[PDB]
């Protein structure tokens, strides 16, 4: 199923 990444400010 879906795989979520981790989103942050670069």
């Amino acid at each position, epitope marked *: *199923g*879906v795989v979520h*990444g*981790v*989103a*942050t400010v670069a």
Partner: nanobody, 109 residues
């Protein structure tokens, strides 16, 4: 999260499972306050990038050359770009794209 004045810029990073990063498209999604999840753009392992119609060249995607990270570079930000931004792969619907850990982007007039 990150916050700017209208007209500003922001870069977001997405770190995702190495097995996924190497093999599958990674999508960026966003969800504005009181609105539904929407797909923004995608990038494949060969750096083919797709964009939704509302991006209009302002947001661009790239892959890090060494790490399992995708970058979303945003320029010319406007208040209606305020949203939580998420990244995902292998989604079964656009709704699933906003189910993970997102980062809040705020653009003030």
């Amino acid at each position: 999260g990150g916050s700017v004045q209208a007209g500003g810029s922001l870069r977001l990073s997405c770190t995702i499972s190495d097995a996924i990063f190497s093999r599958y498209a990674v999508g960026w999604f966003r969800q504005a306050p009181g609105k539904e999840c929407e797909l923004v753009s995608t990038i494949t392992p060969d750096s083919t990038t797709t964009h939704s119609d509302f991006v209009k060249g302002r947001f661009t995607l790239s892959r890090d050359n060494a790490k399992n990270t995708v970058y979303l570079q945003m320029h010319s930000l406007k208040p209606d770009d305020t949203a939580v931004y998420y990244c995902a792969s292998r989604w079964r619907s656009v709704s699933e794209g906003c189910g993970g850990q997102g980062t809040q982007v705020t653009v003030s007039s």
